[PDB]
């Protein structure tokens, strides 16, 4: 089906404690495949998925060069932003950056992105036409005008429609066993007594990939949206994901409740019942 590749960059200034901390990670879909950490001993871009390890020293040398250059621009950006927002030398601040591309289920270019946040808040983003910029702040306007005059969006359009999706497709092919797989959720229910008159019914989905999933409870086929406790999908640590959804079931009423699981790895959606 559909796929994406994304790179995430965080830079955090540390006044009086040296250079800003910089961390870059890259993902294809929900699978991390590279990392750089400016505090770490190696100073190299490093593999985080087995399928990227057989790329070759030209790859590792080049990506280490490019990632270090990203670290350096963010190091300038922090000083630049502090100037724009008239902020003191003393505080720690955060620049985040994300870019990358989606392909549709034909594997052709679908959507491109490139956006920045400052201190947890949208700063500037490339619009979907990849030709113009969204900026909310007055300070961000200085950036927008700089980028318009330097034709950064033209440069980014070229990369997102060409190189970005070409390398996504290469990775999809090279990592076919890991990236073009699905792991269907292995499911179960638990039942714990709150008190004498009700019990919590929890529907579990475990070891699934990719992360996208819908877990819902119905009672006589009516959706129980407002009475369902739902936790955030969470990583198992081994490349799979986990989720649960729970409802409070009054005594004798277990039979009215169904849990509904939708996931790409399932041959049909599951309807589960405590029985």
């Amino acid at each position: 089906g559909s796929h994406s590749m994304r790179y995430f960059f965080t830079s955090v200034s540390r006044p009086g404690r040296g250079e800003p901390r910089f961390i870059a990670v890259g993902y294809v879909d929900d699978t991390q495949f590279v990392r750089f950490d400016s505090d770490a001993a190696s100073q190299r871009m490093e593999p985080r998925a087995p399928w990227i390890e057989q790329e070759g020293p030209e790859y590792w040398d080049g990506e280490t060069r490019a990632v270090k250059a990203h670290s350096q621009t963010h190091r300038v950006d922090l000083g630049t932003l502090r100037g724009y927002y008239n902020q003191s030398e003393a505080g720690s601040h955060t620049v985040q950056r994300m870019y990358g591309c989606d392909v549709g289920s034909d594997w052709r270019f679908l959507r491109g992105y490139h956006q920045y946040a400052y201190d947890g808040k949208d700063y500037i983003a490339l619009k979907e036409d990849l030709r113009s910029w969204t900026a909310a702040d007055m300070a961000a306007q200085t950036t927008k005008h700089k980028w318009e005059a330097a034709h950064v969006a033209e440069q980014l359009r070229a990369y997102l429609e060409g190189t970005c999706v070409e390398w996504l497709r290469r990775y999809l092919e090279n990592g076919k066993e890991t990236l073009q797989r699905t792991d269907a959720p292995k499911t179960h229910m638990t039942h714990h007594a709150v008190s004498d008159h009700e019990a919590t019914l929890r529907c579990w989905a475990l070891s699934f990939y990719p992360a996208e999933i819908t877990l819902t409870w119905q009672r006589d086929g009516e959706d129980q949206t407002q009475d369902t406790e739902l936790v955030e999908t969470r990583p198992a640590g081994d490349g799979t994901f986990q989720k649960w959804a729970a409802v409070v079931v009054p005594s004798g009423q277990e039979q009215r409740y169904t849990c509904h699981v939708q996931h790409e790895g399932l041959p049909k959606p599951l309807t589960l019942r405590w029985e």
Binding site: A66, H70, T73, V95, Y99, I124, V152, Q155
Partner: peptide, 9 residues
């Protein structure tokens, strides 16, 4: 593969 050109805010 990373974007190869410098961008400064």
């Amino acid at each position: 593969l990373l974007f190869g050109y410098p961008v400064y805010v």
